[PDB]
Amino acid sequence: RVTVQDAVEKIGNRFDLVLVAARRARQMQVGGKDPLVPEENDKTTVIALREIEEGLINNQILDVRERQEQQE
Protein backbone atom coordinates (compact mmCIF):
# COMPACT_ATOMS: atom_id res chain seq x y z
CA ARG A 1 0.00 0.00 0.00
CA VAL A 2 1.56 3.26 -1.23
CA THR A 3 -0.95 5.65 -2.87
CA VAL A 4 -4.72 5.78 -3.29
CA GLN A 5 -5.15 7.47 -6.66
CA ASP A 6 -6.51 4.14 -7.91
CA ALA A 7 -9.15 4.33 -5.19
CA VAL A 8 -10.26 7.49 -6.95
CA GLU A 9 -10.21 5.46 -10.16
CA LYS A 10 -12.74 3.10 -8.56
CA ILE A 11 -15.14 5.49 -6.81
CA GLY A 12 -15.18 9.23 -6.42
CA ASN A 13 -15.14 11.92 -3.74
CA ARG A 14 -12.30 10.16 -1.89
CA PHE A 15 -14.44 10.13 1.28
CA ASP A 16 -16.94 7.37 0.62
CA LEU A 17 -13.78 5.49 -0.37
CA VAL A 18 -12.39 5.80 3.15
CA LEU A 19 -15.71 5.26 4.89
CA VAL A 20 -16.43 2.11 2.84
CA ALA A 21 -12.93 0.72 3.21
CA ALA A 22 -13.67 1.07 6.90
CA ARG A 23 -16.85 -0.97 6.56
CA ARG A 24 -15.17 -3.68 4.48
CA ALA A 25 -12.34 -3.74 7.02
CA ARG A 26 -14.99 -4.14 9.69
CA GLN A 27 -16.25 -7.21 7.85
CA MET A 28 -12.67 -8.44 7.45
CA GLN A 29 -11.28 -7.73 10.94
CA VAL A 30 -14.30 -8.26 13.17
CA GLY A 31 -14.84 -11.73 11.78
CA GLY A 32 -17.68 -11.52 9.32
CA LYS A 33 -15.87 -12.50 6.13
CA ASP A 34 -12.44 -12.94 4.59
CA PRO A 35 -11.04 -10.96 1.64
CA LEU A 36 -11.74 -11.55 -2.03
CA VAL A 37 -8.13 -10.65 -2.93
CA PRO A 38 -5.13 -12.63 -1.64
CA GLU A 39 -3.78 -10.65 1.28
CA GLU A 40 0.02 -10.86 1.22
CA ASN A 41 0.13 -10.87 5.02
CA ASP A 42 -1.17 -7.29 5.20
CA LYS A 43 -3.16 -5.25 7.67
CA THR A 44 -6.92 -5.13 7.29
CA THR A 45 -7.06 -1.57 5.91
CA VAL A 46 -4.50 -2.58 3.29
CA ILE A 47 -6.62 -5.51 2.12
CA ALA A 48 -9.79 -3.44 2.06
CA LEU A 49 -8.23 -0.72 -0.07
CA ARG A 50 -6.63 -3.32 -2.35
CA GLU A 51 -9.83 -5.23 -3.08
CA ILE A 52 -11.42 -1.83 -3.62
CA GLU A 53 -8.55 -1.29 -6.05
CA GLU A 54 -9.73 -4.25 -8.17
CA GLY A 55 -13.23 -2.94 -8.76
CA LEU A 56 -14.39 -5.75 -6.48
CA ILE A 57 -15.83 -3.66 -3.65
CA ASN A 58 -17.70 -0.40 -3.30
CA ASN A 59 -21.05 0.73 -1.94
CA GLN A 60 -23.25 -1.24 -4.34
CA ILE A 61 -21.50 -4.62 -4.11
CA LEU A 62 -21.33 -4.35 -0.34
CA ASP A 63 -25.02 -3.46 -0.09
CA VAL A 64 -26.14 -6.26 -2.40
CA ARG A 65 -24.06 -8.64 -0.31
CA GLU A 66 -25.92 -7.11 2.64
CA ARG A 67 -29.25 -8.03 1.07
CA GLN A 68 -28.01 -11.55 0.32
CA GLU A 69 -27.15 -11.78 4.02
CA GLN A 70 -30.69 -10.53 4.68
CA GLN A 71 -31.72 -13.71 2.87
CA GLU A 72 -30.56 -15.18 6.19
Binding site: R14, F15, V18, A22, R26, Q29, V30
Partner: protein, 247 residues
Protein backbone atom coordinates in the same frame (compact mmCIF):
# COMPACT_ATOMS: atom_id res chain seq x y z
CA UNK B 1 35.34 13.31 12.47
CA UNK B 2 32.43 15.71 12.04
CA UNK B 3 30.94 16.48 8.64
CA UNK B 4 29.06 19.79 8.73
CA UNK B 5 27.02 21.29 5.90
CA UNK B 6 28.93 23.68 3.61
CA UNK B 7 25.77 25.59 2.74
CA UNK B 8 25.48 27.17 6.16
CA UNK B 9 28.08 29.84 5.46
CA UNK B 10 26.48 31.84 2.61
CA UNK B 11 23.04 32.31 4.13
CA UNK B 12 24.20 32.45 7.73
CA UNK B 13 26.98 34.88 7.01
CA UNK B 14 29.34 33.69 9.73
CA UNK B 15 32.78 33.48 8.14
CA UNK B 16 34.14 32.79 11.60
CA UNK B 17 33.70 29.06 11.17
CA UNK B 18 35.70 28.80 7.97
CA UNK B 19 38.35 31.17 9.23
CA UNK B 20 38.57 29.54 12.66
CA UNK B 21 38.69 26.04 11.28
CA UNK B 22 41.54 27.10 9.01
CA UNK B 23 43.43 28.58 11.94
CA UNK B 24 42.72 25.55 14.10
CA UNK B 25 43.98 23.34 11.32
CA UNK B 26 47.21 25.30 11.47
CA UNK B 27 47.36 24.91 15.24
CA UNK B 28 46.86 21.17 15.08
CA UNK B 29 49.44 20.96 12.31
CA UNK B 30 52.00 22.63 14.56
CA UNK B 31 50.96 20.18 17.26
CA UNK B 32 51.45 17.22 14.95
CA UNK B 33 54.89 18.50 13.98
CA UNK B 34 55.80 18.75 17.66
CA UNK B 35 54.48 15.26 18.30
CA UNK B 36 56.55 13.82 15.47
CA UNK B 37 59.55 15.61 16.96
CA UNK B 38 58.67 14.42 20.46
CA UNK B 39 57.56 10.78 20.33
CA UNK B 40 60.62 10.19 18.14
CA UNK B 41 62.51 11.97 20.97
CA UNK B 42 64.20 14.23 18.43
CA UNK B 43 66.17 16.58 20.66
CA UNK B 44 65.76 19.36 23.12
CA UNK B 45 67.66 21.98 21.14
CA UNK B 46 65.86 21.39 17.84
CA UNK B 47 62.50 21.15 19.61
CA UNK B 48 63.29 24.46 21.31
CA UNK B 49 64.27 26.03 18.00
CA UNK B 50 61.07 24.98 16.27
CA UNK B 51 58.75 25.94 19.12
CA UNK B 52 60.50 29.29 19.42
CA UNK B 53 60.06 30.10 15.74
CA UNK B 54 56.43 29.00 16.03
CA UNK B 55 55.74 31.31 18.98
CA UNK B 56 56.75 34.39 16.99
CA UNK B 57 55.36 35.39 13.61
CA UNK B 58 53.11 38.26 12.58
CA UNK B 59 53.83 41.97 12.68
CA UNK B 60 54.35 43.40 16.15
CA UNK B 61 52.23 40.81 17.93
CA UNK B 62 51.86 42.10 21.47
CA UNK B 63 53.22 39.15 23.44
CA UNK B 64 56.87 38.20 23.58
CA UNK B 65 57.65 34.64 24.62
CA UNK B 66 61.16 33.28 24.40
CA UNK B 67 63.20 30.45 25.83
CA UNK B 68 65.84 32.25 27.89
CA UNK B 69 64.59 31.57 31.42
CA UNK B 70 63.69 28.17 30.08
CA UNK B 71 64.32 25.31 30.11
CA UNK B 72 64.12 21.65 30.02
CA UNK B 73 62.57 21.28 32.89
CA UNK B 74 60.17 23.31 30.69
CA UNK B 75 60.33 22.62 26.98
CA UNK B 76 59.73 18.94 27.49
CA UNK B 77 56.70 19.97 29.52
CA UNK B 78 55.92 22.83 27.16
CA UNK B 79 55.94 20.26 24.39
CA UNK B 80 54.07 17.48 26.17
CA UNK B 81 51.29 19.96 26.89
CA UNK B 82 51.47 21.26 23.31
CA UNK B 83 51.68 17.83 21.70
CA UNK B 84 47.93 17.73 21.14
CA UNK B 85 48.17 21.04 19.29
CA UNK B 86 49.57 24.48 20.01
CA UNK B 87 46.72 26.41 21.62
CA UNK B 88 46.30 29.77 19.90
CA UNK B 89 44.72 33.02 20.98
CA UNK B 90 42.87 35.69 19.07
CA UNK B 91 41.53 38.89 20.67
CA UNK B 92 37.90 39.62 19.98
CA UNK B 93 38.50 42.39 17.43
CA UNK B 94 42.31 42.64 17.27
CA UNK B 95 42.66 39.09 16.08
CA UNK B 96 44.94 37.40 13.61
CA UNK B 97 44.51 38.43 10.01
CA UNK B 98 44.05 35.92 7.23
CA UNK B 99 47.76 36.38 6.49
CA UNK B 100 49.07 35.06 9.80
CA UNK B 101 46.68 32.12 9.50
CA UNK B 102 48.28 31.28 6.16
CA UNK B 103 51.74 31.66 7.65
CA UNK B 104 50.80 29.14 10.33
CA UNK B 105 49.52 26.88 7.56
CA UNK B 106 52.89 27.19 5.85
CA UNK B 107 54.88 26.51 9.04
CA UNK B 108 53.48 23.03 9.43
CA UNK B 109 53.33 21.54 5.95
CA UNK B 110 49.59 21.72 5.48
CA UNK B 111 48.25 23.36 2.30
CA UNK B 112 48.07 27.13 2.57
CA UNK B 113 44.58 27.21 1.08
CA UNK B 114 43.51 25.24 4.13
CA UNK B 115 41.87 22.62 1.92
CA UNK B 116 42.87 18.99 1.39
CA UNK B 117 41.93 16.19 -0.92
CA UNK B 118 39.69 13.76 0.95
CA UNK B 119 38.73 10.20 0.01
CA UNK B 120 35.23 8.83 0.38
CA UNK B 121 35.35 6.00 2.88
CA UNK B 122 32.79 3.73 1.27
CA UNK B 123 33.73 3.99 -2.39
CA UNK B 124 37.37 4.71 -1.63
CA UNK B 125 37.38 6.99 -4.67
CA UNK B 126 38.39 10.60 -4.34
CA UNK B 127 36.06 13.61 -4.27
CA UNK B 128 36.56 16.51 -6.64
CA UNK B 129 37.33 20.12 -5.69
CA UNK B 130 39.16 19.71 -2.36
CA UNK B 131 37.17 20.04 0.82
CA UNK B 132 38.00 22.05 3.91
CA UNK B 133 39.03 20.47 7.18
CA UNK B 134 40.33 21.78 10.46
CA UNK B 135 39.61 21.57 14.14
CA UNK B 136 36.46 23.43 15.00
CA UNK B 137 35.73 23.66 18.70
CA UNK B 138 32.32 22.02 19.03
CA UNK B 139 30.14 21.90 22.14
CA UNK B 140 27.37 19.63 23.45
CA UNK B 141 24.30 21.71 24.26
CA UNK B 142 21.94 20.26 26.83
CA UNK B 143 19.01 19.76 24.57
CA UNK B 144 19.81 16.12 25.16
CA UNK B 145 17.26 13.92 23.45
CA UNK B 146 16.81 11.30 26.14
CA UNK B 147 15.21 13.82 28.41
CA UNK B 148 13.30 15.06 25.37
CA UNK B 149 11.90 11.89 23.83
CA UNK B 150 8.68 11.03 25.60
CA UNK B 151 5.37 9.33 24.91
CA UNK B 152 2.47 7.74 26.76
CA UNK B 153 -0.15 5.13 25.95
CA UNK B 154 -2.52 5.82 28.83
CA UNK B 155 -1.28 7.75 31.83
CA UNK B 156 -2.98 9.67 34.61
CA UNK B 157 -5.73 12.26 34.18
CA UNK B 158 -6.24 15.72 35.63
CA UNK B 159 -8.80 15.97 38.38
CA UNK B 160 -11.20 18.78 37.52
CA UNK B 161 -11.38 18.19 33.78
CA UNK B 162 -10.87 14.57 32.81
CA UNK B 163 -7.96 15.06 30.43
CA UNK B 164 -4.35 13.86 30.48
CA UNK B 165 -1.78 15.91 32.30
CA UNK B 166 0.78 18.24 30.77
CA UNK B 167 4.29 17.37 31.86
CA UNK B 168 6.75 14.63 30.97
CA UNK B 169 7.25 14.36 34.71
CA UNK B 170 3.53 13.56 34.98
CA UNK B 171 3.30 11.86 31.55
CA UNK B 172 1.46 14.66 29.81
CA UNK B 173 0.28 13.92 26.33
CA UNK B 174 0.94 16.13 23.36
CA UNK B 175 -1.37 19.12 23.17
CA UNK B 176 -3.86 18.95 20.34
CA UNK B 177 -4.15 22.69 20.06
CA UNK B 178 -6.45 24.84 18.01
CA UNK B 179 -4.34 24.89 14.86
CA UNK B 180 -4.25 21.12 14.63
CA UNK B 181 -8.05 20.90 14.76
CA UNK B 182 -8.18 23.23 11.78
CA UNK B 183 -5.48 21.18 10.08
CA UNK B 184 -7.57 18.03 10.41
CA UNK B 185 -10.76 19.79 9.35
CA UNK B 186 -8.98 20.94 6.20
CA UNK B 187 -8.59 17.30 5.24
CA UNK B 188 -11.47 14.93 5.42
CA UNK B 189 -10.26 13.53 8.72
CA UNK B 190 -13.34 13.46 10.85
CA UNK B 191 -13.24 10.11 12.63
CA UNK B 192 -9.58 10.86 13.30
CA UNK B 193 -10.59 14.17 14.82
CA UNK B 194 -13.48 12.57 16.70
CA UNK B 195 -11.21 10.06 18.39
CA UNK B 196 -8.47 12.63 18.95
CA UNK B 197 -10.79 14.92 20.88
CA UNK B 198 -13.24 12.41 22.35
CA UNK B 199 -11.79 9.00 23.19
CA UNK B 200 -8.12 9.79 23.46
CA UNK B 201 -8.46 12.87 25.64
CA UNK B 202 -11.72 13.71 27.32
CA UNK B 203 -14.33 10.97 27.38
CA UNK B 204 -14.41 8.93 30.57
CA UNK B 205 -16.46 5.94 29.38
CA UNK B 206 -15.26 5.85 25.79
CA UNK B 207 -11.59 5.77 26.69
CA UNK B 208 -12.00 2.62 28.76
CA UNK B 209 -14.10 0.94 26.08
CA UNK B 210 -11.54 2.11 23.53
CA UNK B 211 -8.68 0.48 25.42
CA UNK B 212 -10.68 -2.72 25.78
CA UNK B 213 -11.50 -2.86 22.08
CA UNK B 214 -7.84 -2.27 21.30
CA UNK B 215 -6.79 -5.29 23.35
CA UNK B 216 -9.65 -7.26 21.77
CA UNK B 217 -8.58 -6.53 18.20
CA UNK B 218 -11.75 -4.56 17.45
CA UNK B 219 -10.77 -1.07 16.32
CA UNK B 220 -14.13 0.61 16.95
CA UNK B 221 -14.80 3.69 19.03
CA UNK B 222 -17.81 4.58 21.14
CA UNK B 223 -18.19 8.37 21.20
CA UNK B 224 -19.88 9.39 24.43
CA UNK B 225 -19.96 12.97 25.66
CA UNK B 226 -16.74 15.01 26.01
CA UNK B 227 -16.29 15.49 29.74
CA UNK B 228 -15.10 19.04 29.18
CA UNK B 229 -18.47 19.78 27.66
CA UNK B 230 -20.22 18.37 30.70
CA UNK B 231 -18.19 20.69 32.91
CA UNK B 232 -19.11 23.55 30.61
CA UNK B 233 -22.76 22.53 30.96
CA UNK B 234 -22.52 22.67 34.74
CA UNK B 235 -20.73 26.01 34.48
CA UNK B 236 -23.10 27.70 32.04
CA UNK B 237 -25.94 26.36 34.15
CA UNK B 238 -24.32 27.45 37.40
CA UNK B 239 -25.60 30.92 36.58
CA UNK B 240 -29.31 31.53 36.23
CA UNK B 241 -29.10 30.09 32.70
CA UNK B 242 -30.81 26.90 31.56
CA UNK B 243 -28.83 25.32 28.76
CA UNK B 244 -29.94 21.83 27.81
CA UNK B 245 -29.41 19.22 25.12
CA UNK B 246 -32.68 18.97 23.24
CA UNK B 247 -34.17 15.74 21.93
Amino acid sequence: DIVLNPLGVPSRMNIGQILETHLGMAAKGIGDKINAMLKQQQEVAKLREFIQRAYDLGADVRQKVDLSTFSDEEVMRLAENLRKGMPIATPVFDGAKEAEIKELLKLGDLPTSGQIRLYDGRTGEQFERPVTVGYMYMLKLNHLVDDKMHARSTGSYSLVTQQPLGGKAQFGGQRFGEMEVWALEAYGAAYTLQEMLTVKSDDVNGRTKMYKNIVDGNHQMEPGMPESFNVLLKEIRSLGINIELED
